[PDB]
Amino acid sequence: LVCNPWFEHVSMLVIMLNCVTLGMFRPCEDVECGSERCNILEAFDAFIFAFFAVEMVIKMVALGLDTWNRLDFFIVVAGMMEYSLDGHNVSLSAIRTVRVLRPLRAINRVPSMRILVTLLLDTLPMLGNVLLLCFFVFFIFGIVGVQLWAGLLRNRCFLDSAFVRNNNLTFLRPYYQTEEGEENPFICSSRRDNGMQKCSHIPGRRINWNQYYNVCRSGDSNPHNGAINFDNIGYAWIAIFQVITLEGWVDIMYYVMDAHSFYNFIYFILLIIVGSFFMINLCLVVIATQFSETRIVDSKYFSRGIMMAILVNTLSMGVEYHEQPEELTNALEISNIVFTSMFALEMLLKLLACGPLGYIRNPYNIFDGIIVVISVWEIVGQSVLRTFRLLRVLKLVRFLPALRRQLVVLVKTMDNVATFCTLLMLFIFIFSILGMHLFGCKFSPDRKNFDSLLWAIVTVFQILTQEDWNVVLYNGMASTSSWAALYFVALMTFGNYVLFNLLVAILVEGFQRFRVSCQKVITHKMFDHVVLVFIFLNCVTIALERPDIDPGSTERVFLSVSNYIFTAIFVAEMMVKVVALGLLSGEHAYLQSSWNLLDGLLVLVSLVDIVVAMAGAKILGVLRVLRLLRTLRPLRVISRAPGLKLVVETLISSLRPIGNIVLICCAFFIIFGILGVQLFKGKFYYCEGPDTRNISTKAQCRAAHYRWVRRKYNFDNLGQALMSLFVLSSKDGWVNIMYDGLDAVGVDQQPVQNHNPWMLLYFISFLLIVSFFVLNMFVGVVVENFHKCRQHSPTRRSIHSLCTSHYLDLFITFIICVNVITMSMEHYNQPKSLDEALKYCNYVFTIVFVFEAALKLVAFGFRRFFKDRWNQLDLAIVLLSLMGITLEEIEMSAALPINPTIIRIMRVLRIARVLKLLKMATGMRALLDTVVQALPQVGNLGLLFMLLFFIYAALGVELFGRLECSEDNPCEGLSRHATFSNFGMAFLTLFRVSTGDNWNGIMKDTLRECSREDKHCLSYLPALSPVYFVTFVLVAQFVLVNVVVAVLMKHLEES
Ligand SMILES: CCCCCCCCCCCCCCC(=O)OC[C@H](COP(=O)(O)OCCN)OC(=O)CCCCCCCCCCCCCC
Ligand SMILES: CC(C)CCC[C@@H](C)[C@H]1CC[C@H]2[C@@H]3CC=C4C[C@@H](OC(=O)CCC(=O)O)CC[C@]4(C)[C@H]3CC[C@]12C
Ligand SMILES: CC(C)CCC[C@@H](C)[C@H]1CC[C@H]2[C@@H]3CC=C4C[C@@H](OC(=O)CCC(=O)O)CC[C@]4(C)[C@H]3CC[C@]12C
Ligand SMILES: CC(C)CCC[C@@H](C)[C@H]1CC[C@H]2[C@@H]3CC=C4C[C@@H](OC(=O)CCC(=O)O)CC[C@]4(C)[C@H]3CC[C@]12C
Ligand SMILES: CC(C)CCC[C@@H](C)[C@H]1CC[C@H]2[C@@H]3CC=C4C[C@@H](OC(=O)CCC(=O)O)CC[C@]4(C)[C@H]3CC[C@]12C
Ligand SMILES: *[C@@H]1O[C@H](CO)[C@@H](O)[C@H](O)[C@H]1NC(C)=O
Ligand SMILES: *[C@@H]1O[C@H](CO)[C@@H](O)[C@H](O)[C@H]1NC(C)=O
Ligand SMILES: [Ca+2]
């Protein structure tokens, strides 16, 4: 019965059987219960539920009245309620949802998966301090957002009520709305605010009605069908949660810039730095620590010959492109015969040298054998076997022992990855079925839907990658209820929590006479500081450069003259230093260090700039190239600052241990790049027009007077293919590229939605394998840092007792906790009765703090009281509260000498009372301290991060400073808020790129061609653009990775 294993096997078979019937659910067809197919599935489910009742009875009879035994009881109890309730028509379909819990029974039946889930549950309790820090972020930023932006995103530009009445015409739509509709709302700034968008910015007609929408006031709805707004604490948290995931966080920022003020970017930069970066990556650090506490053939020349032969063949497959000349097609097949024959000869010699059994004694010889016969099989049989010619690159692991030793190490990582993958697949399956029950057949259809198991799993998988997950959220909220956000919050939270534990699991198994004067000047203590000032001033000159400076303006004269002065100063600095040390004859000479070589090259480039500028000659092309190099002069700051020099050299040394993983990742990119060209070259064209459903070929597109155009990210050649793979790896806009590959039909054929669903294997396989390499690169850097780190008064006394006793602290805690509750009750258009109730509460809390300060004064004495910082903090809030109450009362009276701005700020500043809880949070203070001790390392990396932005911010203005956007030449990523028109706007844009929010959209806008009519084009910008974004993304991520490692190491040694 119970003391034998086969009874558990039978239980596992029935549990697996339920997984099949749950996946067979059809949300559109089964909910009506009409089909015979349905009738037998409910019959199967009743059969399965009957067994589960029998199992529970037997195990009950055997044992008498363990989390996992409770769990089976909960599932049986809930199932019986649903099973027996059949008969009452009220909410029966909603109660059917409890069935999605049943696959959880597999956890306890599978031993290895049972142990893993035990470790997760034992590690969760300790995350209380991280959770406490999370509440502080959501409450502080939640209340601040509501008091600032409540009801503003309902603003629209309306017609004047007097205008519509006196003119006796009502055919006009009441408020301005774009031709697209309410999905693109024109949010306007009210007269009592200073937002970026006014009703005077409405375009004219394209018979002048648009100019009569001249009053800005509240409408009925907020953006995205009411999903995005700050009308209450509830909607504020949904907006904050989306920002913390760094998905569509700029669209939220643009709304409040249009409606309220430009300087709202401060709110989102602080929320992203504190909330997204530190508060999420402290979750990893905490788990990381806790989980740790818990005669011719054998010749060298012959081997080298075959080595280069394989390499040349592998690379020749990369010269394919869309419109090949047929003589190039024939050349590649001639080249195939030569190399195929060469490997065939190689096998023949080795078979004669060792005999067949001797040849089979080596596995790599067996592998090479299978490829040769498959290659010969293709030639004799003259598109299937062509793809398998990519396997020839695998022969190089024989001749690369260094890479061979890395591959086996990665393989040894995958024996524990398997355990986590099983738990994730069960995790994804449960949410995939849940989504079908909640949202099935209700997103009427969108590609991102839960109408079937295949696209339910893909949608759930997509949400975990956090790509357009906000688009699915708005569908869920609008279709069912605003409380549908908890589905996505739980999915992302638990999904990422489980993924951190995989990263930690790998880490822990990883740990297991004039010359005399010059020499004196160069050795002066103040030489570096004196030169650092000129470098700083030169940076200011670069920041002021922008395209809109008129050539004849005084600013141009100031900037041009400054260039000559700085050029002379740094020529003199170099000269004096070269005289002191010598150029390259001495051992201390100038060019004996790379930091001196860099300065030399910059000075040379500067001199060439003077020479070219002196030319009245056909040197326009060369001039623009030198302008780009002038943006690299700020790099001289690194060598003058010892702090930056150490960090910069540290990052370079950190690439050594992960050198082989990068090479394997690069080889993977090319193998998939070549494969993508073979699959999709020439098929990413499409017809662009208003009525296109009737078009099916290029010829019909031409006939319809439309235009035949190509996607920006495509696979027409290996150069285009690599750019597409990078966008997939970064997982920004990767879903759109996947649709193009799923809809590909052929050359000169219109793509058809979901034409080839089997192409999901190509795109999903690349994301998974690439993520596995990037996961092992982060581990490699951590393991290296760890290995190197470990190698390196009768009436007064009674009051004093009360103040000394803990009773006062608990009373203080209760009052502020109640205050936080009253601060969350504010909301747009709240009733006047609530206004009176809240202001009365403010009276009570202020009096309590005033007494709290008095008693503390009486107990401890003035100066001894004031010594403690916490006591100083109390006095500030008490003082802060008094001025806020005073301003409020006087303004509410008849006199009005105060600005409504000062009242707003004082009202917002009362959120500072939350800091009085921080004293009780001893655990959280220790966690925050862990970051405070890591500033000397994290601080220097921050300087490098800002220096990275400065060079690319200045470079961006030079490259993309003149790119326009218009209805004639539309742009997908750039807008009125994201531009490189000046250094200030370029800095803000790079922060968006750094977070990765739709950075791929900005690159598109630079890949699109120049107009035939317009001037100032750079015909080779589409070639420079990928290099700019690719290098920035990699360097930016690498720098931020080391910041996490710096904090991670300190916590381990500190603990
Ligand atoms: C740290 C705190 C938790 C952080 C978690 C972040 C994610 C929060 C998402 C959950 C909030 C979802 C509710 C949003 C909300 O209140 O607005 C929707 C709802 C209106 O729904 P209708 O579709 O019926 O609208 C039509 C109106 N006729 O608004 C309300 O009805 C207000 C009631 C709730 C007040 C706000 C407090 C909600 C409590 C949230 C707690 C979530 C905790 C999750 C850990
Ligand atoms: C060492 C560095 C970091 C010093 C600080 C950087 C500044 C030099 C940056 C930051 C703010 C920038 C300014 C932000 C806004 C403007 C207004 C704008 O001026 C105009 O000509 C108005 C635009 C229009 O005509 O519509 C563009 C240049 C300027 C002065 C920017 C020039 C570059 C500035 C001064
Ligand atoms: C070789 C590997 C190890 C490194 C990666 C370098 C790539 C960026 C190189 C390798 C082969 C190159 C390609 C070889 C041949 C062509 C065809 C050539 O075709 C055309 O002139 C287009 C004509 C048309 O189709 O209208 C355009 C450049 C391109 C794609 C090259 C772009 C740059 C590529 C992809
Ligand atoms: C290995 C990973 C990290 C990505 C590598 C970076 C790529 C995004 C870059 C490297 C070189 C770039 C290429 C350099 C030169 C060109 C010019 C131009 O190439 C062509 O001649 C093809 C255009 C055509 O079809 O005619 C268009 C883009 C392309 C291939 C670039 C596409 C983007 C590439 C492949
Ligand atoms: C302190 C944290 C844990 C939240 C729990 C405290 C509650 C007592 C507060 C939090 C936010 C408050 C809500 C904020 C705003 C609103 C919306 C208001 O009007 C609506 O229902 C809006 C309709 C819409 O959804 O558009 C009714 C009061 C209510 C629910 C408030 C009632 C009291 C709530 C639920
Ligand atoms: C323009 O707007 C103002 C303010 O709402 C209004 O008084 C005026 O009548 C409007 N003018 C026209 C021509 O609609
Ligand atoms: C599509 O085009 C065909 C001719 O090619 C025409 O007969 C048909 O009416 C069109 N269908 C629609 C509705 O556009
Ligand atoms: Ca994105």
Residue numbers in the entry: 96 to 160, 169 to 309, 338 to 425, 788 to 875, 881 to 942, 952 to 1019, 1282 to 1384, 1388 to 1564, ...
What does the paper say about this structure?
Eventually, a variant with the deletion of residues 493-772 resulted in an elevated expression level and decent solution behavior. This variant was named Cav3.2EM, as it was used for cryogenic electron microscopy (cryo-EM) imaging. Following the functional validation of Cav3.2EM, we performed standard cryo-EM single particle analysis and obtained a three-dimensional (3D) EM reconstruction at an overall resolution of 3.0 Å. Two glycan chains were observed, attaching to Asn345 and Asn1466 in the extracellular loops in repeats I and III (ECLI and ECLIII) via N-link. All four voltage-sensing domains (VSDs) adopt the depolarized or “up” conformation, and the intracellular gate is tightly twisted. The closed intracellular gate comprises three layers of hydrophobic residues. The first assembly site beneath the central cavity includes conserved residues Leu415, Leu1010, Phe1550, and Val1855, a common feature observed in the structures of all three members of Cav3 channels. A spherical density, likely corresponding to a Ca2+ ion, is surrounded by four residues, Glu378, Glu974, Asp1504, and Asp1808 (the EEDD motif) in the selectivity filter (SF). Examination of the 3D EM maps for all the structures, including that of the apo channel, identifies a well-resolved density in the cavity, which can be best fitted with a phosphatidylethanolamine (PE) molecule. The two hydrophobic tails penetrate the III-IV fenestration, and the polar head inserts into the central cavity, directly contributing to drug coordination.
